[PDB]
Amino acid sequence: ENLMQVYQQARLSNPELRKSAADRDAAFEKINEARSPLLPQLGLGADYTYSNGYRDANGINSNATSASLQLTQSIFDMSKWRALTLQEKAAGIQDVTYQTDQQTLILNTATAYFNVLNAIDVLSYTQAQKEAIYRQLDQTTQRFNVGLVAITDVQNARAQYDTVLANELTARNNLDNAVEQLRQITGNYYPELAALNVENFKTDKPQPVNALLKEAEKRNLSLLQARLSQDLAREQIRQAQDGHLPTLDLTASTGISDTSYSGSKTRGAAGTQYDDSNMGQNKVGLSFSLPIYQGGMVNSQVKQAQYNFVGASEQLESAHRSVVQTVRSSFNNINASISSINAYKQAVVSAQSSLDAMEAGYSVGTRTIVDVLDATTTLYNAKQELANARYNYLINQLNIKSALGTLNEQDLLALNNALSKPVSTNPE
């Protein structure tokens, strides 16, 4: 019904933003996977075996039956902590992109609303045009029958009347397409939308350029993601270096087994070596490692990290200059919109004066009714142009708010106060 309600529904219905939220959640979950290797480990290895001697070594047999648990726990390894830092950076990146997605959704909802309104206005204008052209065709046909013109004039009138029929059909197709494209965002059919009230339309002047640029350089999203990217590149440089550092880990276990034997040929001159025995082992101990002369395996891995970091630093500079140009362009666009609005208001007044003149002439009997209809068509065209300009101005203010990096739902709340009168999308 209103813009606020439409956005409220689209917020909790839209699938793209929900995909962004799901991706953020799955990314925050990778932190747990990062820490897991640090914590202890536990396993089991029970098994069995059967040997056999041959090639003059027959008559000797054995039976293995093992079962043991194992605990492993690392006590010093800096590589693992690098992973946790990197995962935290990834979580930050995901949050930033989620914010960008929300802002994009706000922009798209506003754009769809205003597109629907513009379609309504254009449809009305084309209907008026069709009426005028039909009236003109009737006059020309009536004159030809009377005997004042030739067949070619009637043919031209019919062509002009046929063209407007195609334009009228196209307008309805555009309106239906706009309604469906709004449903694609919101997910619902909206018979009516609130219309702009001209009594309280705002044309406030914007702030200086340098202030806007300075504020944007603080809480913008693209450059924030660039900064986080450079930080994770540095964290990636740290990770590479720790490949040539020693580490320690602890190992523990316990197990039992039975190792009885059997056989006839085994008997004889055993010498106590062929006796059944049961045994267990409970080894526990630490370990250490340290690499040397690896052919610069990790040494050359470090140089790759530094080049990547300088590339990230270059991308950040590119992002900075891009933000500069974008904000400047948005500001100039706002100014152009103001000027265009003024021009269109003047045009509307001129058309109104012409229509009044044409109507008075007809009332006194100096003009036909085709002139009245043509004047009406011109006035409706001017009204459509003015409405389009107003909608573009509102969209541009929202766009500069987005470029600044400070777009929310409370900002859009104010715009709702400019929309008062309901209008049907497909009136009967």
Next chain:
Amino acid sequence: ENLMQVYQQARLSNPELRKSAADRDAAFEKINEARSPLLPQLGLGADYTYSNGYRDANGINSNATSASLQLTQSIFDMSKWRALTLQEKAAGIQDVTYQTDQQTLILNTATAYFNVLNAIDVLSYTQAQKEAIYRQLDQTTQRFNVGLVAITDVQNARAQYDTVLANELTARNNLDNAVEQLRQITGNYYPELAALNVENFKTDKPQPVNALLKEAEKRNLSLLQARLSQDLAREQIRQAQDGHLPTLDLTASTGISDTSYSGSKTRGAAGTQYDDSNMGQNKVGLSFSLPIYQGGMVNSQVKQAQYNFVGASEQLESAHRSVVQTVRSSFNNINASISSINAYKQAVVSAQSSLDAMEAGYSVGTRTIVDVLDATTTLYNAKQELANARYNYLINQLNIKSALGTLNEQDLLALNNALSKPVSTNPE
């Protein structure tokens, strides 16, 4: 040189589809790779060693030589089966992409075929306009040199003539570029192509929108691939829980090793402990292992998989909305084409009257040849626009049917009745 003969060769010459076929064949053959690990594996293990004890074990020399074979057969580990399921689903996705590429090939070939003929028509119009503009220049120059006209008029006529010459050059270049575009798809240069048979054109009517929507939901390619992706995500979730499952393997090995003992200490009072032996080994056994805690890593992979699944579901919903809006748009486009065809038909009906009236006046002597030529140019304009409208209608029919996903080559009678005598592509 009709569409069918051009498309038959395009089918077996187009590298865009051939790459898709190669990708599908790579995807399919890859399954046999994933079934390899389950089967048994054999290998050889010969090697050599040499040792020299020190510290307590001084003066002890030894040398060893061994060689054996190994064979491991996985008894129960579903991890490998889930790989097969995932890979077959990947093959399905690839086949869907192949179907999409085939439809794309068909549509692109048809579009290029019509573009060539459109270029030819506009070229003919430009030639007529050039002739008319030249006859105007001659008229003005003769007048000026006899009087009746200032020089500025001569220069204006010269300017118009130069402009039409530039347009003619542009049209020739466009005609060559479109042919080059027709050689880039099919792979052959076509000097002559068939054209539309105007006397047998069909302005058919489309089916209701709801029936198209149902057919699309049932048999559309994009949403089918999306459903395959959703099933793949579920299978991946099933694969995540596979971690907790225990695994066991059956391994058997055999080999020989003949080791001899020597040394001053060994000789003398050996006591049978240091005597040489020539026994073999035929070890056969099993193995079983299962994780107990693992620090909750799998309990995190399970949640990552669930988040991925919900993201895939959101993607599928988005694709559904997209297909709905696309089918609606295509239907509206067909209707718009019908209306435009009617409008242009009336427009050409009208222009014929004026060129007919200009000719009679010259026959009696009320007009000049310049009027006749200008009328001819206008009618040529009415002729080039109508042909463009017809070609657009045909392409839009193909587009709606492609949105339905139901066209590969059943456009046999669709265009066969629409062909006519050959028309050259690059006349000289």
Next chain:
Amino acid sequence: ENLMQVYQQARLSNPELRKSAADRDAAFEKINEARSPLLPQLGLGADYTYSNGYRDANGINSNATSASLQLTQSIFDMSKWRALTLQEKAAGIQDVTYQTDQQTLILNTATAYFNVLNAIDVLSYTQAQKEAIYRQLDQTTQRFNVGLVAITDVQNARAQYDTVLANELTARNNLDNAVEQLRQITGNYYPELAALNVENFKTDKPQPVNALLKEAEKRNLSLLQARLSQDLAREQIRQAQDGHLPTLDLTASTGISDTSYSGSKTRGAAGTQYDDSNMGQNKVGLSFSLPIYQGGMVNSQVKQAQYNFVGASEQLESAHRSVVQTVRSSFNNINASISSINAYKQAVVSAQSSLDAMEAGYSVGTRTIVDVLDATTTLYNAKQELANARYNYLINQLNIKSALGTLNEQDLLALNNALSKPVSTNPE
């Protein structure tokens, strides 16, 4: 100050090209880590272990300690050589993309340079139009005050004045944005730039298309990329087949150990078997293996590699076709530009004549000052067209040289000879 200087500054100040260089450096450095697995891989170890396993031996204490080195050196394996070759091919690919980035930088700088002059021309002519329309409004308002026209005609003049005001504002904003976009390439603000020298402009004729095609086949960067990628696919096919051949390795080690026990019960009539030891060993040996049966792993890789090879061949064919098409399209754009230049020259001459006629008529009193202002505006616009045409010709020559694959600073130098007139980028 001028084109050559701007390019010189951008050659080293442009971040995109520097990122490309960083990528090239990363690719070349990668060769080092492919070499590394050939050299010896020395290492160090050390681990204590306490054990009291007592399935049958209760009260036995046996600590353990060890510390040893390691060395490994591969003898025969073609898994590493293939990696070296493939990394070299990747480096070549990176070099080619770097060269492409160079050419892109030159093109972007030239386009950004010419857009500023276009903006200057547009601004001047828009200001002239504003002056003319203001004089028209003054005349109309005076006439209405005198009592010769109706109020309706005043509104039209006011509307036109507002429209021209808006157009002028848009022109100024476009000039500002074009200045900013050139700073996004070089990082500097240019108060003034050099303009074209009209009396020193050349109109050459392009070389025959066959020679251009031959040169493109010789030295087109994208085709070089395609051929290198295909070679990289063939070498990968060779790599896959090499998973069959056997492998040979050499290892060596040396270390110590204590394995000291304790306990009163152990001491006494132990038979010397349970006494503490301080043994040491320096074992060294080789290790060989040759696979026999691996399943479809060996078989499937080769078929997949061949499929990838045919895919690469298809991609190369696409590259060839695209190159030919682009060469012809640029070659034709050149001639189109020549023709447009001729047409706009004629238009300028015609406008000059009209202006002179108007001026003489006003000198003798047959015309109002308003008429003169309009002719000046028409002439001024005619120089907007002719200026924007020559810049298009230069840009098109630069593009065709780029497609030929021979675009260097030497080529860009030839343009600057025609730019020998400074002009401000911000009038008043």
